Nucleic acid binder design. Structure first.
Lengths: 535, 374, 461, 166, 182
RNA sequence: UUGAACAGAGAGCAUUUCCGGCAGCAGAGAUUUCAGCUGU
């Protein structure tokens, strides 16, 4: 019941800023007891969790954590991990865009000249290698290692497991950025057209075309928590999109100049964006407040990536530089480069690497291992980053050790429970709710009778009229705002009685001004008009 | 699955085991990962009784480490909370699962029963009675379960009526094994010896004889004979009279060698009338089983019956007051043998001579015994 | 520097021997499992669609049916698969509802067999072999109540005098009949309601409120000495046999065609009457129904409780039966067929899983209670899956996109059109009532549960 | 209700304890009639509690002839006395399921607290355990049941015909 | 992907991972398989041209049936495509909408003209032979298989001289004259 | 329908009756476990 890690398992609910029905009160006590019992027996599983995340801790003060070479790491770790830290070297086809699968099993490299390859990177099994002689840009897997989508010279192509072409997308005119929403089965695409396109991969149907209306799209990342896509344009504007709304759900002014790279935490809370104004920014995403602004980098951060344990890798040409606990709200977590005189409130880099001769293309963490695979101008290189991988995976979401029968069955299972595209909101706790209109107090038809009664008495009681008040500075008197917002040709009875009540309000303001200034006494209310009433 | 269910049935004891701070969290994780290995191997496919046994051995070792570490950390024998009974409850339940999954393994059944008896004051004899009940329903043929069951309820609990019920039900199931019969006679003479020695003790402070054992001897011989003749020449009795008579003598040899074993294991009950309770067996041997014990074959066993009868009161020490008082009895028996048989008279005289020369100042009486046997 | 990485060790996750399942190392983090509302929403939606494609409720008609329409049905309350039906040309039958074949068929009477029920007849001189004979008695409008024995194949204990062990006789016709669950007693309604026992050939007593005829009876099930009756002066009269006397009547707007008592609440009953709804009434306060089940379009002819006391089944004169939950007040499922005409007698089998319907084309049909539930025994994986789906449909029950699927059936043409014109007439009388409520002063609000009780003897304070 | 089951077979007598009742009113339905071919849905219904084997081929032949002409033998009496609980003779007897409607009276003559059921529900539970056989027994018997049935069928036939080898 | 069971096949009817609706039945793949088209966009670069001819024939049929602008331009387009070999006959004007087709423009390629002239055995071997540089039209060697060989210009498809294939057919009929190199 | 005596089952329901607190010691079972009495 005490459970030091319950706040990770808590679920937030509706607060309005208690009942008398006994049966409903019992139902609500049962609901609250069941919720607390399920949270406690859910959070009591960290005893059962098998592995533990890695670390590298300096054990000294002369040992800085970032001056540790990969040679020292590969000596100090075991042979399975130092054999996983691969190094492909493929010099003639161009800068290699690297993508992994969603589990750590497969790798998909995409040379800029023509060279695409889907492989098992920890076996030695390559299962597609194809030299599409035109300049390919990016590639992703779709829902398995079985299908992969490549963004070629203009058209996006979809190839199967052994490389045969399955589809040539006539839309997706010039993709440069591909992505996949795997619960929703949507291939997302942006590029040199200013359009964002979602292609439902199961049925085969373009779910949405969205005008970004900001020229070519410079960076694009997926928020894994709610599957909204963050794009990054040439204004230094990040924009959060959903396939339901033909506009961005949010528009953030992140940087000056363009935006080079976007990366999102897997808890959907933080976003690191680097722009070409040599600046990195860390954003809260659930509140859209800017946490950190690391400005004046030595050279513009061309790539950002965020692991499953909140590490933050930045690439600025040849350099790769990782910070640990830079996704926090304290200012003493802002990622710096040097602790001026050993200041322990400064976030010096976790580690670093200099890909000396070349310039890195893009980073991607291997999903469930302690590796950061970065693709560069001559091939691929995994980097053993010890603090940067979810060690305790869930095996009935996605499984590194899966078999062919488990792959077949999990494929049909997720295909069956494919979420629709319209359930992509800014938060996924919104699709059991009631409307944000349609009032909270449930109307038990006595109030519906009362609503018809006030609607039947809106005339001759003036319920749909602003009430008379002379003491509200009559240049903004509400009734004059009614008469001014209405169109000045038409006459209707509502504006007739608003006109009458405005003149009445002006008369009461006239007599209050007169008996404030003292030209007249208390009421003396027009003796002969009193007598001539009844006529 | 269900490995997840059992694996999270195991967490409140280690909530307790970290609260009472003897095991830290970092080693609760270690015993829990080994528990994960074992639980998956148990209730997946491809399982074995050795996986059950290795789980029980690991749970005993972590229990003993928990007791040792509770003594060493807290200087207290037991923390009188959940942590001390729950792992014994776990070991009992692993045993229960393994016995309900593989109920062909008497080794695992016996390890269950030995653990549940030797659990101590924590256990219940109704929790022993239920697992003896289901083991005995599963294996009605394996007689050593009934033997151990009655011996548990007598030589621990001493409930004589219920051990009588156990032996009567087991003899309803297999009236063919002589081991069950001989252990029933053993129980009953154990019972009457405890009965008459408590009679002697209560007499010293301040009806029921071996007749029950004689009746179970009677029905023991009758049923064992019926089952052996119905057993051999198995499928049918399609035979001639030569096979009938030869098989009837064959059952007689089997039955009477076993009643010899009854006597040689009957004699050691020296607090009651061993003479009378061997005299009833000698009297039952004296009658005929339609195979003519003294009129015909089993004539060497007729000599063995006469020899047992002659030594029945001559079961004596070297102190030969009784032998001097009743040597004329053996002399009259040897005279009756010399008056009737021809080669058996010679064999009985020679065997009585070697009997005196084996079971024989006092050497002058030994010359008198040699000149009495000469 | 200390360096630790992720070590997977490859034996804890992919097993050594080839004959066992792989592990499922597992992490209950919500960040691991992201879309927790949409994922179980689409599971609830797929569950509702799978319910709507697994709904196949018709099991089978039993036998070849009668010749002239089934007007009386009684299940026997101790044995699960035996059910006795009486036609309108006399021939009553005992049914084995597993093979769906008759044990025996008796030309019982010459007029209509107007009611029948079952018994364990406690004679004081004969012990009836209840494990081999089953007993049903039957009243008619040739003025007779006959009691029959049936040879029954349910045990093999023994190893034969079937028909008409005795013939009770009256002076007027008989309409309904129901038996006490103990003490060999039964009661018949007719021109007047009599109480009988199976020993004497004459009524023990006559328990008549007035000289108005009696159309239906039911005994109570627990608290086994309270009778209830429907008289054709729209009347519901309770009877108490501890005082051997009538108890209280209420008079309604239209005539009650059937009563059935609650097996699990002992004082609640449900009346099925001619205004096309069924009223769930309390015995200890008969001034208001405590539920109204409102979905038929013609005169409701019979009602039954499930033996769990949880839902009622209700067959009417539109050719359809309907299952209502007890706590709601509207339908839960309609069963119709083209070959089912004018369903007159509906019972809920004692399993609470099947529903027996007797129409007037001759036939007796078996329906499922839950039309999407099969009857096999279920392994633990699919039992957990199916009750998970039912809990998920329950909590998402009124999202619009799954409400409009779990609400939707194919109702036949006449019942549909009668429903929609009843809806427009109901909206017109609501609107005109609201207008006259706007004008006049003394317009009270009578509740829907009091809209139909034109009076009560022995008023309440 | 079908609480215990009696299956006689050439190795011995077995008493099963019924866990779940198969469906009575839908007993001819498709899923109910294929759950006795499925094993993962038959072990939900039937569970073994006792198996008393035979002494040999002599006792097996005598018991096969007694089970033929419907007489309760001593081994059958012993196993039913061990397994079936002491119910009433007048109010809710215990309930055994057999395959022979004229073995029924012979069992009720010895144990009058036992109702013997042989209708089609007990019949298809019986044919379920005859269909599965060695899997239900949890590995506890010695002897190949195929060789047992071969020897027993030859024994029964030679006895019934009075086959002479002389 | 796993040959869905019956409730799955009923619950997800539109799922198909290979054939989509925008593929138009894989006719790019199918006619480029028929005529052995090397690179992927040749079908669609021909499809733009078939679309332009069919658009123009549509707009040009929408004019009144008597006016000479309509009649003259339909005859000019019809003679143009017939002399380009894309059409087979200039008989009726509904050939401009029915029978102009990417497979027609592809049948007018050079390896297909080779195969229909019996200069190879199949379209793949014709593609191999003119990738290997044996085939000239007129005097000049042609090296890419995409070359479109009009009605006049298919009287000049020959092999080059000194080609081993010309040498071997002349020496098959033992008419090989080694004076003129082959 | 009730009661008696008898035979049970473990399958229910409690509780302030003791124990799961230590020494002295015998006895039983393979250096450890179990089986009762004199004061807490």
């Amino acid at each position: 019941k005490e459970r030091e890690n319950q706040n990770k398992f808590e679920r937030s609910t509706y607060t309005n800023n208690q009942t008398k029905d006994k049966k409903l009160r019992a139902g609500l006590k049962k609901i609250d007891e069941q919720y607390k019992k399920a949270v406690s027996s859910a959070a009591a599983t960290d005893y059962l969790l098998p592995e533990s995340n890695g670390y590298l801790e300096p054990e000294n003060e002369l040992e800085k954590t970032f001056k540790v070479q990969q040679s020292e790491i590969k000596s100090s770790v075991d042979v399975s991990t130092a054999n996983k830290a691969l190094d492909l070297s493929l010099k003639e086809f161009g800068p290699y865009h690297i993508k992994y699968a969603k589990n750590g099993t497969h790798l998909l490299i995409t040379g800029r000249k023509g060279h695409v390859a889907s492989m098992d990177w920890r076996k030695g099994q390559l299962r597609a290698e194809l030299f599409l002689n035109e300049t390919c840009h990016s590639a992703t897997y779709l829902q398995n290692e079985q299908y992969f989508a490549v963004a070629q010279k203009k058209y996006t192509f979809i190839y199967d497991h052994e490389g045969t072409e399955l589809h040539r997308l006539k839309q997706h005119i010039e993709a440069r950025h591909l992505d996949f929403l795997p619960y929703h089965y949507l291939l997302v695409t942006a590029g040199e057209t200013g359009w964002l396109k979602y292609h439902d991969v199961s049925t085969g149907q373009l779910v949405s075309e969205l005008r970004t209306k900001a020229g070519p799209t410079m960076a694009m990342a997926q928020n894994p928590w709610n599957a909204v896509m963050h794009l990054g344009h040439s204004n230094g504007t990040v924009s959060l999109w959903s396939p339901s709304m033909p506009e961005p759900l949010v528009k953030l002014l992140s940087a000056r100049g363009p935006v080079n790279s976007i990366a999102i935490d897997r808890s959907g809370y933080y976003m690191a964006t680097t722009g070409a104004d040599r600046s990195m920014k860390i954003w809260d995403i659930r509140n859209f407040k800017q946490l950190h602004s690391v400005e004046s980098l030595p050279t513009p951060g061309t790539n950002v990536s965020i692991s499953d344990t909140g590490l933050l890798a930045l690439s600025r040409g040849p350099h790769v530089t990782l910070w640990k606990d830079a996704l926090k709200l304290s200012g003493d977590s802002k990622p710096c480069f040097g602790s001026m005189g050993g200041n322990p409130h400064r976030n010096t880099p976790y580690m670093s690497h200099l890909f000396a001769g070349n310039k890195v293309e893009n980073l991607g963490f291997v999903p469930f291992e302690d590796l950061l695979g970065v693709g560069h101008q001559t091939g691929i290189t995994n980097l053993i980053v010890p603090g940067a991988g979810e060690a305790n995976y869930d095996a009935l979401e996605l499984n590194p050790f899966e078999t062919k029968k488990q792959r077949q069955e999990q494929e049909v299972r997720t295909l069956l429970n494919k979420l629709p595209a319209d359930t992509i909101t800014l938060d996924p706790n919104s699709i059991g709710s009631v409307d944000k209109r349609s009032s909270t107090i449930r109307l038990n038809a006595k109030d519906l009778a009362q609503t018809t009664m006030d609607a039947n008495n809106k005339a001759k009681t003036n319920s749909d009229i602003p009430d008379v008040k002379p003491d509200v500075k009559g240049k903004n008197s509400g009734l004059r705002s009614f008469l001014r917002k209405k169109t000045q040709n038409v006459i209707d009875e509502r504006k007739l009685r608003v006109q009458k009540q405005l003149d009445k309000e002006k008369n009461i303001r006239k007599r209050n001004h007169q008996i404030k200034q003292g030209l007249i006494s208390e009421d003396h209310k027009d003796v002969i008009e009193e007598a001539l009433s009844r006529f | 699955s269900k490995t997840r269910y059992y694996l999270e049935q195991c967490i409140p004891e280690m909530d307790d085991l970290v609260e009472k701070g003897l095991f830290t969290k970092n080693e609760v994780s270690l015993i829990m990962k080994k528990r994960t290995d074992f639980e998956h191997r148990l209730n997946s496919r491809g399982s074995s009784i050795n996986d059950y046994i290795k789980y029980i051995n690991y749970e005993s070792n972590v229990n003993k480490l928990r007791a040792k570490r509770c003594k060493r950390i807290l200087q207290v024998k037991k923390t009188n909370s959940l942590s001390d009974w729950s792992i014994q409850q776990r070991i009992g339940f692993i045993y229960q699962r393994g016995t309900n999954k593989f109920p062909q393994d008497l080794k695992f059944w016996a390890m269950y029963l030995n653990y549940m008896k030797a659990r101590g004051n924590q256990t219940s004899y109704k929790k022993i009675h239920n697992i003896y009940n289901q083991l005995l329903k599963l294996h009605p043929t394996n007689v050593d379960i009934w033997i151990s069951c009655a011996k548990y309820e007598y030589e621990v609990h001493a409930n004589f009526k219920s051990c009588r019920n156990i032996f009567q039900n087991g003899l309803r199931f297999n009236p063919d094994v002589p081991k069950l019969w001989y252990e029933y006679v053993k129980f009953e003479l154990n019972f009457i010896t405890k009965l008459i020695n408590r009679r002697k003790v209560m007499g010293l402070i301040n009806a029921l004889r071996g007749d029950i054992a004689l009746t179970i001897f009677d029905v023991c011989m009758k049923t064992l004979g019926k089952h052996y003749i119905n057993k051999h020449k198995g499928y049918y009795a399609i035979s001639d009279s030569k096979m009938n008579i030869e098989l009837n003598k064959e059952t007689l040899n089997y039955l009477f060698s076993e009643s010899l074993r009854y006597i040689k294991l009957f004699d050691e009950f020296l607090d009651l009338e061993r003479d009378y309770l061997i005299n009833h067996v000698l009297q039952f041997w004296k009658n005929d089983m339609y195979d003519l014990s003294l009129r015909k074959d089993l004539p060497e066993l007729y000599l063995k019956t006469v020899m047992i009868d002659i030594t029945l009161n001559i079961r004596y020490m070297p102190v030969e007051k009784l032998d001097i008082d009743q040597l004329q009895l053996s002399v009259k028996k040897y005279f009756a043998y010399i008056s009737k048989l021809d080669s058996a008279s010679v064999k009985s005289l020679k065997n009585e001579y070697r009997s005196y020369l084996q079971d024989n100042a006092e050497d002058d009486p030994r010359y008198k015994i040699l000149d009495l046997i000469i | 520097m200390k360096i630790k990485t992720i070590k997977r060790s490859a034996d804890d996750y992919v097993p050594v021997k080839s004959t066992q399942e792989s592990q499922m190392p597992r992490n209950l983090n919500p960040e691991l499992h992201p879309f927790e509302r949409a994922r179980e929403y689409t599971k609830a939606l797929n569950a509702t669609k799978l319910e709507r494609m697994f709904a196949k409720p018709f099991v089978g008609q039993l036998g070849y049916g009668h010749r002239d329409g089934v007007y009386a049905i009684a299940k026997n309350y101790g044995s699960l698969n035996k059910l006795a039906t009486g036609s309108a040309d006399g021939v009553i039958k005992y049914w084995n509802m597993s093979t769906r074949e008759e044990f025996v068929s008796f030309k019982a009477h010459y007029g209509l067999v107007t009611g029948l029920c079952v018994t364990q007849p406690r004679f004081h001189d004969k012990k009836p072999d209840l494990k081999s004979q089953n007993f049903m008695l039957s009243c008619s409008d040739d003025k007779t109540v006959k009691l029959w024995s049936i040879n029954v194949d349910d045990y093999s204990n023994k190893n034969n005098e079937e028909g008409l062990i005795r013939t009770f006789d009256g002076e007027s016709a008989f309409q309904g009949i129901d038996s006490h669950r103990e003490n060999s007693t039964f009661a018949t309604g007719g021109a007047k309601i009599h109480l009988w026992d199976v020993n004497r050939l004459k009524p023990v007593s006559d328990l008549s409120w007035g000289a108005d005829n009696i159309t239906s009876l039911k005994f109570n099930q627990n608290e086994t000495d309270i009778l209830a009756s429907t008289g054709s002066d729209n009347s519901i009269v309770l009877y108490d046999l501890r005082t051997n006397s009538p108890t209280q009547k209420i008079v309604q707007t239209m005539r009650t065609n059937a009563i059935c008592w609650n097996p699990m609440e002992a004082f609640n009953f449900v009346t099925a009457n001619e205004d096309h709804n069924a009223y769930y009434y309390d015995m200890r306060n008969l001034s208001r129904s405590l539920n109204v089940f409102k979905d038929h379009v013609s005169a409701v002819m019979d009602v039954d409780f499930s033996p769990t006391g949880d839902e009622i089944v209700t067959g009417s004169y539109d050719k359809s039966i309907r299952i209502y939950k007890t706590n709601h007040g509207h339908s839960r499922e309609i069963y119709h067929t083209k070959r089912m005409q004018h369903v007159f007698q509906v019972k809920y089998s004692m399993d609470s899983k099947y529903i027996i319907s007797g129409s007037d084309d001759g036939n007796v049909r078996l329906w499922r209670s839950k039309a999407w539930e099969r009857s096999n025994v279920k392994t633990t994986r699919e039992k957990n899956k199916l009750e998970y789906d039912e809990k998920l449909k329950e909590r998402f029950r009124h999202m619009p996109e799954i409400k409009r699927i779990s609400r939707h059936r194919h109702v036949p043409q006449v019942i549909k059109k009668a429903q929609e014109i009843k809806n427009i007439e109901l909206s017109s009388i609501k609107r005109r009532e609201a207008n006259e409520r706007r004008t006049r002063k003394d317009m009270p609000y009578i509740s829907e549960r009091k809209k139909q009780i034109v009076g009560t003897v022995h008023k309440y304070e | 209700p079908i609480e215990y089951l009696l299956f006689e077979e050439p190795t011995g007598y077995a008493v099963f304890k019924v866990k779940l009742q198969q469906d009575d009113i839908g007993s001819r339905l498709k899923e109910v009639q294929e759950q006795i071919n499925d094993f993962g849905a038959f072990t939900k219904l039937i569970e073994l509690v006792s198996f008393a084997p035979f002494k040999g081929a002599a006792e097996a032949l005598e018991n096969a002839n007694d089970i033929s002409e419907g007489l309760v033998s001593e081994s059958l009496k012993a196993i039913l006395d061990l397994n079936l609980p002491k119910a009433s003779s007048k109010k809710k007897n215990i309930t055994l399921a057999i395959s022979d409607k004229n073995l029924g009276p012979s069992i009720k003559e010895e144990f009058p607290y036992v109702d013997c059921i042989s209708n089609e529900l007990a019949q298809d539970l019986i044919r379920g355990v005859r269909l599965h056989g060695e899997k239900l027994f949890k590995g506890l018997q010695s002897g190949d049941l195929e060789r047992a049935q071969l020897g027993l069928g030859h024994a029964y036939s030679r006895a019934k015909v009075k086959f002479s080898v002389q | 992907v796993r040959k869905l069971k019956h409730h799955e096949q009923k619950l997800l009817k539109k799922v198909d991972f290979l054939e989509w609706k925008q593929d138009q039945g894989h006719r790019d793949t199918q006619v480029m398989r028929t005529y052995h088209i090397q690179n992927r966009e040749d079908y669609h670069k021909y499809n733009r041209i078939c679309g332009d001819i069919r658009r123009l024939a549509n707009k040009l049929s929408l004019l009144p049936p008597t006016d000479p602008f309509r009649r003259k331009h339909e005859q000019l387009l019809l003679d143009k495509l017939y002399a380009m070999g894309v059409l087979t006959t200039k008989s009726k004007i509904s050939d401009l909408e029915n029978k102009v087709t990417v497979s027609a423009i592809c049948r007018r390629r050079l390896p297909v003209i080779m195969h229909r002239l019996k200069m190879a055995e199949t379209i793949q071997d014709a593609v191999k032979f003119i990738e290997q540089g044996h085939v000239r039209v007129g005097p000049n060697l042609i090296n890419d298989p995409a070359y479109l060989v009009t009605r006049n210009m298919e009287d000049y498809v020959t092999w080059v001289d000194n080609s081993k294939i010309k040498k071997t057919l002349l020496r098959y009929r033992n008419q090989i004259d080694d004076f003129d190199f082959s």
